[PDB]
């Protein structure tokens, strides 16, 4: 009778409450006997770096100079990353400069994106 409250897994009968989740991503599957098989590769592995010796801190000194925001663009990245090599080889097949014809075959495909964050 409550049409306004959000539909959660706390509300229906036993089957409803078991079936609905809370947004947690799946980790494996269910076999016969409702035994849950957890797939290791499905579990997000946290790639945490070693922070020993790191100099950066959560905050920045107010003594730091102010600067103008210049959002990075594809043109700027190309100029700062590919243009030098292109000029040096033109003065003297784009895969040599970094371009890849297709994202297929890569672990981290840029589109459709196949990696977290």
């Amino acid at each position: 009778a409550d049409r306004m409250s959000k539909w959660t897994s706390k509300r229906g009968p036993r089957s409803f409450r078991g079936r609905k989740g809370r947004g947690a991503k799946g980790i494996g599957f269910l076999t016969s006997g409702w035994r849950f098989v957890q797939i290791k590769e499905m579990v997000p592995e946290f790639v945490v770096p070693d922070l020993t010796g790191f100099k950066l801190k959560p905050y920045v000194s107010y003594l730091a100079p102010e600067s103008e925001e210049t959002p990075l663009t594809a043109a700027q990245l190309f100029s700062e990353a590919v243009a030098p090599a292109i000029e040096k080889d033109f003065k003297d097949n784009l895969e040599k400069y970094g371009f890849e014809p297709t994202q297929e075959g890569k672990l981290f495909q840029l589109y459709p994106r196949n990696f977290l964050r």
Binding site: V82, A83, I86, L94, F99
Partner: protein, 243 residues
């Protein structure tokens, strides 16, 4: 408030916008133009003026077409502009009697037709009117190629029209392969209906089919900005070297 445009002009406005605007001009003109179908279920007036006997004066007369209902089954067949008449009658044909709902349906037959241009036999649900029209046109191919969209009133008929027109436009050797003389004879027989292939591709397409065709034509995976920037940089370097 009021709309800037009348609501009945909204479809035309939409046609003048978006992908429908990118649609080819000849197809858009074919959609926009509307011709009254040939009278089928009513007898047209002989002339534009008539001496009505009641007062003996010359009065203008108009032919008001009977609304015809075409069930979706008709789009899979060739009904010669014939369809269901959904109307009403006066019982015993006197206006002072009851008014009854009456549906007149055409007598449908299944017949096999051979298309010379397509070298194929089609089994088509058909009417005696369609058979008579085919006889008057001297064959199924002539009937399909002569009859306009409105008189044909069949999605299957318009698809046959598109197929025949494409065959003629391409002069496709797939018509009787290994018999070029026969193929040329057929094409010469139906020469007068030949049109450019760019136009024959769009014959008989519904608006949604045409939109999908245009979207498929103009769908291109975006060129990587790497290629664009490389071309621009090489062009700029060429200009700098020349200067």
């Amino acid at each position: 408030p009021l709309h800037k445009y009348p609501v009945w002009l909204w479809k035309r406005l939409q046609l003048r916008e978006g992908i429908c605007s990118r649609l080819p001009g000849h197809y858009l003109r074919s959609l926009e133009e509307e011709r009254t179908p040939t009278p089928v279920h009513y007898r047209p007036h002989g002339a534009k003026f008539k001496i009505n006997p009641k007062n003996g004066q010359r009065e203008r007369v108009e032919d008001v077409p009977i609304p015809i209902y075409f069930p979706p089954e008709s789009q899979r067949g060739l009904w010669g502009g014939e369809g269901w008449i959904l109307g009403q009658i006066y019982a015993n044909n006197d206006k002072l009697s009851k008014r009854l709902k009456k549906v007149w349906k055409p007598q449908l037959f299944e017949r096999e037709f051979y298309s010379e241009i397509l070298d194929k036999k089609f089994t088509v649900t058909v009417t005696m009117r369609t058979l008579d029209l085919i006889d008057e046109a001297y064959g199924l191919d002539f009937y399909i190629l002569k009859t306009p969209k409105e008189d044909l009133c069949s999605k299957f008929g318009m698809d046959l029209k598109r197929g025949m027109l494409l065959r003629l436009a391409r002069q496709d050797p797939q018509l009787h392969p290994e018999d070029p003389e026969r193929r040329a004879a057929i094409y010469d027989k139906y020469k007068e209906f030949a049109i450019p292939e760019e136009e024959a591709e769009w014959v008989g397409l519904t608006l949604e089919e045409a939109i999908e065709k245009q979207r498929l034509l103009e769908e291109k995976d975006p060129v990587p900005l790497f290629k664009i920037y490389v071309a621009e940089l090489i062009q700029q370097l060429q200009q700098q070297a020349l200067s």
